[PDB]
Design an enzyme around this catalytic site. Structure first.
Site, PDB file in Angstrom:
ATOM      1  N   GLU A  40      39.900  34.878  51.000  1.00  0.00           N
ATOM      2  CA  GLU A  40      40.250  35.910  52.316  1.00  0.00           C
ATOM      3  C   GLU A  40      39.778  35.183  53.830  1.00  0.00           C
ATOM      4  O   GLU A  40      40.494  35.402  54.566  1.00  0.00           O
ATOM      5  CB  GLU A  40      40.040  37.126  52.198  1.00  0.00           C
ATOM      6  CG  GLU A  40      40.772  37.874  51.010  1.00  0.00           C
ATOM      7  CD  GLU A  40      40.544  39.318  50.799  1.00  0.00           C
ATOM      8  OE1 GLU A  40      39.497  39.883  50.650  1.00  0.00           O
ATOM      9  OE2 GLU A  40      41.539  40.197  51.016  1.00  0.00           O
ATOM     10  N   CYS A  75      46.803  44.128  40.615  1.00  0.00           N
ATOM     11  CA  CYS A  75      45.930  44.607  41.553  1.00  0.00           C
ATOM     12  C   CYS A  75      46.725  44.611  42.986  1.00  0.00           C
ATOM     13  O   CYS A  75      46.148  44.876  44.120  1.00  0.00           O
ATOM     14  CB  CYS A  75      44.738  44.049  41.598  1.00  0.00           C
ATOM     15  SG  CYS A  75      43.799  44.662  40.212  1.00  0.00           S
ATOM     16  N   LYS A 100      35.962  48.528  49.066  1.00  0.00           N
ATOM     17  CA  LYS A 100      35.433  48.298  47.955  1.00  0.00           C
ATOM     18  C   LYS A 100      33.783  48.239  47.641  1.00  0.00           C
ATOM     19  O   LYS A 100      33.144  48.548  46.537  1.00  0.00           O
ATOM     20  CB  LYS A 100      35.897  47.128  47.174  1.00  0.00           C
ATOM     21  CG  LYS A 100      37.320  47.365  46.776  1.00  0.00           C
ATOM     22  CD  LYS A 100      37.929  46.213  46.322  1.00  0.00           C
ATOM     23  CE  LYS A 100      39.502  46.173  45.965  1.00  0.00           C
ATOM     24  NZ  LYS A 100      40.278  45.981  47.173  1.00  0.00           N
ATOM     25  N   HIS A 126      40.950  42.872  50.966  1.00  0.00           N
ATOM     26  CA  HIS A 126      40.876  43.229  49.679  1.00  0.00           C
ATOM     27  C   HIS A 126      39.430  43.355  49.392  1.00  0.00           C
ATOM     28  O   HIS A 126      39.166  44.569  48.823  1.00  0.00           O
ATOM     29  CB  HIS A 126      41.528  41.966  48.999  1.00  0.00           C
ATOM     30  CG  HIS A 126      41.586  42.428  47.632  1.00  0.00           C
ATOM     31  ND1 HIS A 126      42.584  43.158  47.002  1.00  0.00           N
ATOM     32  CD2 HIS A 126      40.841  41.787  46.365  1.00  0.00           C
ATOM     33  CE1 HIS A 126      42.261  43.174  45.611  1.00  0.00           C
ATOM     34  NE2 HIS A 126      41.371  42.242  45.204  1.00  0.00           N
ATOM     35  N   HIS A 183      36.409  49.243  42.809  1.00  0.00           N
ATOM     36  CA  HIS A 183      37.572  48.384  42.499  1.00  0.00           C
ATOM     37  C   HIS A 183      38.455  49.401  41.648  1.00  0.00           C
ATOM     38  O   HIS A 183      38.123  49.347  40.564  1.00  0.00           O
ATOM     39  CB  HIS A 183      37.582  46.931  42.221  1.00  0.00           C
ATOM     40  CG  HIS A 183      38.833  45.964  42.213  1.00  0.00           C
ATOM     41  ND1 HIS A 183      39.894  46.978  42.749  1.00  0.00           N
ATOM     42  CD2 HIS A 183      38.958  44.900  42.078  1.00  0.00           C
ATOM     43  CE1 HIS A 183      40.753  45.717  42.905  1.00  0.00           C
ATOM     44  NE2 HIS A 183      40.167  44.467  42.471  1.00  0.00           N
ATOM     45  N   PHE A 202      46.043  39.555  39.601  1.00  0.00           N
ATOM     46  CA  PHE A 202      46.024  38.574  38.514  1.00  0.00           C
ATOM     47  C   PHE A 202      47.545  38.122  38.529  1.00  0.00           C
ATOM     48  O   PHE A 202      48.414  38.906  39.011  1.00  0.00           O
ATOM     49  CB  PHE A 202      45.526  39.169  37.238  1.00  0.00           C
ATOM     50  CG  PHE A 202      44.139  39.138  37.071  1.00  0.00           C
ATOM     51  CD1 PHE A 202      43.222  38.726  37.891  1.00  0.00           C
ATOM     52  CD2 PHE A 202      43.588  39.787  35.856  1.00  0.00           C
ATOM     53  CE1 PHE A 202      41.840  38.656  37.634  1.00  0.00           C
ATOM     54  CE2 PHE A 202      42.209  39.934  35.726  1.00  0.00           C
ATOM     55  CZ  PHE A 202      41.500  39.426  36.778  1.00  0.00           C
TER      56      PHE A 202
HETATM   57  C1  LIG Z   1      43.110  47.379  30.223  1.00  0.00           C
HETATM   58  C2  LIG Z   1      42.881  45.985  30.194  1.00  0.00           C
HETATM   59  O1  LIG Z   1      43.063  45.458  28.939  1.00  0.00           O
HETATM   60  C3  LIG Z   1      42.738  44.886  31.001  1.00  0.00           C
HETATM   61  C4  LIG Z   1      44.147  44.587  31.609  1.00  0.00           C
HETATM   62  O2  LIG Z   1      44.756  43.818  30.938  1.00  0.00           O
HETATM   63  C5  LIG Z   1      44.904  45.287  32.883  1.00  0.00           C
HETATM   64  C6  LIG Z   1      44.665  44.248  33.936  1.00  0.00           C
HETATM   65  O3  LIG Z   1      44.166  43.202  33.920  1.00  0.00           O
HETATM   66  C7  LIG Z   1      45.180  44.650  35.291  1.00  0.00           C
HETATM   67  C8  LIG Z   1      44.984  43.538  36.262  1.00  0.00           C
HETATM   68  O4  LIG Z   1      45.587  42.486  36.286  1.00  0.00           O
HETATM   69  C9  LIG Z   1      43.901  43.673  37.512  1.00  0.00           C
HETATM   70  C10 LIG Z   1      44.217  42.489  38.518  1.00  0.00           C
HETATM   71  O5  LIG Z   1      45.315  41.873  38.712  1.00  0.00           O
HETATM   72  C11 LIG Z   1      42.975  42.347  39.619  1.00  0.00           C
HETATM   73  C12 LIG Z   1      42.857  43.967  40.076  1.00  0.00           C
HETATM   74  O6  LIG Z   1      41.413  44.075  40.148  1.00  0.00           O
END
Ligand SMILES: CC(=O)CC(=O)CC(=O)CC(=O)CC(=O)CC=O
Lengths: 71, 408, 347
Positions: B311, B159, B332, B300, B337, B396
């Site tokens: 934040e 993200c 958001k 964010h 999001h 993440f």
């Molecule tokens: C599609 C799946 O199975 C879930 C994932 O792994 C994708 C994922 O997890 C992307 C991600 O890290 C999102 C963030 O950092 C925080 C943002 O909102």
């Protein structure tokens, strides 16, 4: 029971002999919210009963998880 | 030798609106783009009942690639760029994503296994299915269409990927490798795997509500998770000298960029917010601008318990006692999001805000949180003269990303 | 601008579980497709059971590669300032091995089917975050998923971060896990027949999983601590070719890396048939005379790892370990029509 203790031993990576069932999970074994959610998923798998976020939040120790599955 | 970077074109596909004109009008008035959905609760058994949709049987609609091509077309037309103006060797693409075409990958997996019951059938795997696993489908397709010969990249830093794509795009222009640069992010995560992944993690809003649009309420005491959304944001970044010679319209100057790691947790964010505070500080040093000129922040604002406190305390650490006056908002609250796409869509909104000297509100502001006690511009927006703007992003792997935007 | 140097390298592959084992095998081999797994490998000694439980094998391959690279560099990791160390990663296919059964079970059972680690295990940026928790590295850290040339960009932009003075040390590299049923069945069928619209037809070749990482750091910082410098990263190239016309023009930017040096070895992509014709013609125009060495038949297609593992080997060759070369230039390109190249120089 032995089925509960083996999961908490494997998930937290503690020796099953040295693991205490009455000890606090968050304080002593520095357990995070994701591991508690992962633990709750495997309680649903093994026993076959509905577990929600309101219910598994109160699981403070290894005896609290045993008291829930009995009910 | 270092050159100034400016935004000359905007293109957006968002739940609040498709196209710059429709997108702005809705966020100006404070209209929610969040929709109630039924297939989550009934079929799969998710506690969530709100999504940010732009427009049960599984479909490979290729939304991730579609939103990228649509936003790019709008952005290039808005910038007024044509083959004559564009030099291929000095024009590069940077379209980011967190999960790319995960919907297509999920649909492919369940088709070849017949509803996930049996093992994988090799014969059922089509030639077209390989395109779904390509993460940089959006980047290469856009580069092909407008003849971009400079660096084509796909940053997938969760993200924070959106701002990181703008960050690397800024570096290309500033250090003299590119004259024009198509930057942003596209996301299509409204599939069971993506929604179920966050649902299982407990990051989505799960509280019972009469109005599902209120489920996303940044800096509110009621907040319990982020409302997942889809969409795409595309910014046409180019050199200040290059824009002036062809007489291009300038939205705002992209002054500086910085990115750090938490070294704390993968999903959880700490309360003190020291890492994010250091990222804001390094972004201002990078832009060579004093924190005293900062009078607006596009936060964010995911509407989780841990992000909004992180934040608020981060802004309190950098600015100090001067933090209280500064209008801070989260898009958001209206859009939901869109992961990596949310950074780009908010970056498009940020450029429009500086241009029109207006600040969009944080809607669904119910009970004020005692911990979050800054100006969050609740429910109704207003005209505000923005000098130096901040844009905070988090994802993440403990990734914090900040860009400093400025009026010309 | 700051001078960037390679101080440590680590890689794991079906041919070897360390850099010396891999280098000795490829030299021996230098003198329908299948996925080649690692032999005599287990991540029990390196990674603890708590962390290993909740990460995919591509993150496992990444951490063991980084640990080997940091040990070779002889960096006092504890004394290093965490704000001046970053992590650059290249990964295309993600981590399907950890989530496959959970994605299938979601459509039969429901939410009970998939657990809470699907959100962090699968995404490509998992490796950078997992590394940042273990070592505590806090500087600018990015992940690229650009098809084929993900890891090639990761090293190049990690060097640019050191050049511009964002960080003093950088753990740049790539990792891939292709043994999971979904991507395994995909690569065994579709990848063989598919041709590149820009480059042309593919050579017959297998696939191999694993990881390759380099410890890039600032030259003065390396000389300060008295480090065993393998080689210097002199140049980086990152361009695209939408059609066949621009393709040949883009290869001339790879020829600029040589600086008209005659004592140079050119490591090629080795995926497509027409490469040797078009690249040699670009060198003929710029009056460049070099030796062509293809490692792709021996190393296989590793996607993001390909090009990175070449840079790991090239760093080992230039570190006083073909005859006598003082510069190795590695080239890679994608199906969609990328053109990426790295330049490494001796001393
Ligand atoms: C599609 C799946 O199975 C879930 C994932 O792994 C994708 C994922 O997890 C992307 C991600 O890290 C999102 C963030 O950092 C925080 C943002 O909102």
């Amino acid at each position: 029971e032995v089925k509960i203790k083996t999961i908490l031993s494997l998930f937290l990576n503690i020796n099953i002999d040295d693991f205490n069932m009455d000890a606090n999970l968050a304080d002593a074994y520095d357990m995070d919210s994701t591991e508690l959610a992962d633990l709750a998923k495997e309680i649903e798998k093994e026993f076959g009963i509905s577990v929600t976020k309101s219910q598994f939040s109160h699981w403070e120790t290894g005896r609290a998880v045993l008291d829930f599955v009995s009910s | 030798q270092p050159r100034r970077v400016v935004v000359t074109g905007l293109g957006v596909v968002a739940p609040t609106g498709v196209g710059v004109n429709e997108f702005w009008n809705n966020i100006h008035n404070g209209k929610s783009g969040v929709s109630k959905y039924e297939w989550g609760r009934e079929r799969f058994g998710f506690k969530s009942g709100a999504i940010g949709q732009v427009y049960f049987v599984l479909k490979s609609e290729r939304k991730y690639l579609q939103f990228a091509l649509d936003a790019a077309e709008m952005a290039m037309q808005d910038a007024n760029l044509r083959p004559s103006d564009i030099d291929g060797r000095r024009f590069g693409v940077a379209i980011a994503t967190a999960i790319a075409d995960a919907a297509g990958m999920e649909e492919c997996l369940l088709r070849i296994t017949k509803g996930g019951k049996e093992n994988i059938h090799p014969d059922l795997i089509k030639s077209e299915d390989y395109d779904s696993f390509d993460f940089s489908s959006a980047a290469t397709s856009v580069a092909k269409k407008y003849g971009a010969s400079m660096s084509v990249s796909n940053i997938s830093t969760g993200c924070a990927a959106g701002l990181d794509a703008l960050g690397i795009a800024m570096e290309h222009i500033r250090y003299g490798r590119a004259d024009i640069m198509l930057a942003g992010a596209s996301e299509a995560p409204l599939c069971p795997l993506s929604i179920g992944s966050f649902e299982a993690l407990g990051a989505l809003s799960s509280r019972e509500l009469e109005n599902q649009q209120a489920a996303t309420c940044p800096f509110s005491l009621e907040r319990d998770g982020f409302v997942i959304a889809e969409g795409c944001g595309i910014l046409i970044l180019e050199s200040y000298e290059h824009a002036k010679q062809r007489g291009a319209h300038i939205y705002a100057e992209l002054a500086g960029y910085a990115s750090v790691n938490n070294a704390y947790h993968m999903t959880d964010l700490p309360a003190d917010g020291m890492a994010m505070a250091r990222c804001i500080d390094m972004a201002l040093k990078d832009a060579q601008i004093s924190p005293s000129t900062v009078n607006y922040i596009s936060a964010h604002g995911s509407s989780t318990a841990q992000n909004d406190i992180n934040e608020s305390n981060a802004i309190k650490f950098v600015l100090g006692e001067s933090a209280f006056g500064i209008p801070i908002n989260s898009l958001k609250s209206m859009t939901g999001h869109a992961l990596a796409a949310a950074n780009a869509i908010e970056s498009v909104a940020l450029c429009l805000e500086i241009e029109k000297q207006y600040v969009h509100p944080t809607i669904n502001y119910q009970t004020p949180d005692p911990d979050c006690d800054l100006d969050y511009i609740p429910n109704q927006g207003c005209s505000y003269p923005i000098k130096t703007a901040l844009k905070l992003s988090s994802g993440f792997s403990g990734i914090h990303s900040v860009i400093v935007m400025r009026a010309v | 601008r700051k001078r960037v140097v390679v101080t440590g390298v680590g890689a794991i592959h079906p041919d070897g579980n360390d850099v010396t084992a891999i280098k000795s095998k490829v030299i021996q081999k230098l003198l329908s497709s299948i996925i080649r797994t690692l032999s005599d490998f287990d991540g029990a000694k390196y990674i603890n059971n708590r962390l290993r439980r909740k990460i995919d094998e591509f993150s496992v391959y990444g951490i063991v590669a980084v640990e080997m690279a940091l040990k070779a560099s002889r960096l006092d990791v504890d004394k290093l300032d965490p704000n001046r160390v970053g992590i650059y990663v290249g990964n295309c296919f993600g981590g399907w091995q950890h989530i496959e059964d959970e994605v299938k079970a979601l459509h039969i059972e429901g939410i009970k089917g998939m657990g809470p680690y699907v959100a962090t295990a699968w995404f490509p940026a998992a490796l950078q975050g997992q590394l940042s928790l273990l070592y505590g590295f806090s500087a600018q850290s990015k992940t690229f998923s650009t098809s084929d040339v993900a890891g090639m960009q990761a090293i190049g932009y990690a060097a640019e971060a050191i050049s511009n003075g964002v960080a003093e040390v950088m753990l740049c590299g790539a990792s891939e896990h292709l043994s999971s049923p979904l991507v395994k069945n995909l690569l065994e069928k579709t990848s063989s027949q598919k041709h590149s619209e820009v480059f042309g037809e593919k050579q017959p070749g297998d696939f191999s999983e694993g990881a390759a990482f380099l410890v890039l750091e600032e030259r003065q910082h390396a000389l300060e601590r008295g480090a065993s410098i393998l080689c210097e990263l002199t140049g980086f190239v990152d361009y695209f070719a939408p059609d066949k016309n621009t393709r040949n023009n883009t290869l001339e930017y790879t020829a600029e890396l040589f600086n008209h040096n005659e004592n140079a070895v050119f490591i090629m992509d080795g995926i497509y048939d027409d490469e040797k014709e078009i690249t040699s013609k670009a060198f003929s125009n710029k009056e460049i005379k070099t030796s062509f060495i293809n490692l792709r038949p021996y190393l296989d297609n590793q996607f993001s790892v390909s090009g990175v593992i070449d840079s790991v080997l090239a760093s080992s060759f230039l570190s006083e370990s073909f005859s006598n070369t003082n510069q190795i230039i590695i080239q890679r390109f994608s199906n969609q029509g990328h053109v990426c190249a790295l330049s490494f120089s001796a001393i």
